[PDB]
């Protein structure tokens, strides 16, 4: 299982924190957090590669294509960049982009996709952040 | 740069810069779209990655082609296919003369078509006007601007309601209940479907209880027999004018039977009780169906 490379950063403890942060989960979905490790590996992403910027940029990705309401993931910005966010954000933006061409332009993700990657270990809690209403 | 140089510019506009494009030494002429960046990021915009996203997993013959993405840090190229015109123009050029019946009826089986391919693969367009919709020289017709398109197979996302011009957005947006669905792609090629006919749009209002109260003056004020739960919708209102429905010749006199047979069922109020675009495609409405050659 791949996954695993993919549940060591859900160890690290600002990561939990922006999950405690989320919790209508509203951008951390466990669609999303599904869709984040397709990227990863759509990216072809070394085990070197599996960065926290990384994971940030891809969950960014993911709400830009899956959630219409745009201005939640804003919140994003500072876990990723510090205090300083407000002028770190367009470089941000910039690796989202390199991360989008570096996965050709597959950021669509379908659900059958995230179903089977949510099926290979449905003890982990990252699966059980439904979102209701 | 490659084989290809800016012939002339097509238009401008929110989307960005379309130019059209061609090469020499061969011939081929292709649509290059300049994608305007974002102001505070200089990053690409959602729209932009929506779009190419949706397209390159989209190949359909009635769906316009992704040919290539140019992408460098500070422009960014969306390579398209050239299509002669978008039919508003067609429709603009035509509004004296007329369209004929076999070619609109030709370009809506198409558009039900790549519409049909569109929701099968759990992809909305919820931007469905004439201008998005591509004409050639030999009776093609193709869906195009994906801009403000989305997938909808992943549960308990978040939507928005500017989908498109009033004209052509469903009642059931304008009425602010959101969970809409495939449904309102239907109701958008059903006012186009009309707009083909007279030459002239079916509900042209200014604001979206002005737009709600021509759609109720065409089709009748909505009851809870007709749609039931239109009377708690959040935008709904009781001090509506009551307007009883029209007969469909003094709405569309040239069709035929089961030509307001089937726009009948495309405006239907009900989202859960419109048509789908197979069933569209199944209609009474598309059994001499041919393919025409346009006038351009």
Known sequence: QDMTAFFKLFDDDLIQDFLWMDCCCKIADKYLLAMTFVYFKRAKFTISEHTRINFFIALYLANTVEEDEEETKYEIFPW?????????????????????????????????????????????????????? | ?????????????????????????TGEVVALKKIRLDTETEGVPSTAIREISLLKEL??????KLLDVIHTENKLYLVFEFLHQDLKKFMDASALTGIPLPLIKSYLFQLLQGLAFCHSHRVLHRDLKPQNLLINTEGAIKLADFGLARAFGVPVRTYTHEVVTLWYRAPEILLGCKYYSTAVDIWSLGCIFAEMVTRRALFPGDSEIDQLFRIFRTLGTPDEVVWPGVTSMPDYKPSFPKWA??????????????????????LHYDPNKRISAKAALAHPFFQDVTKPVPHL
């Open chain 2, 1 to 25: 740069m490659e084989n290809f140089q800016k012939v002339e510019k097509i238009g401008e506009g929110t989307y960005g810069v379309v130019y059209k494009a061609r090469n020499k030494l």
């Open chain 1, 80 to 133: 990723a960049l510090g205090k300083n966010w407000r002028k770190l954000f367009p470089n941000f933006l910039k690796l989202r982009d390199q991360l989008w061409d570096r996965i050709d332009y597959r950021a669509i993700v379908s659900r059958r996709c995230c179903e089977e990657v949510m099926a290979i270990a449905p003890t982990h809690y990252i699966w059980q952040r439904e979102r209701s209403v």
């Open chain 2, 245 to 266: 429905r029209q007969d469909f010749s003094k709405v569309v006199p040239p069709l035929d039977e089961d030509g307001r047979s089937l726009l009948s069922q495309m």
């Open chain 2, 59 to 64: 190949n359909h013959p009635n769906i316009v």
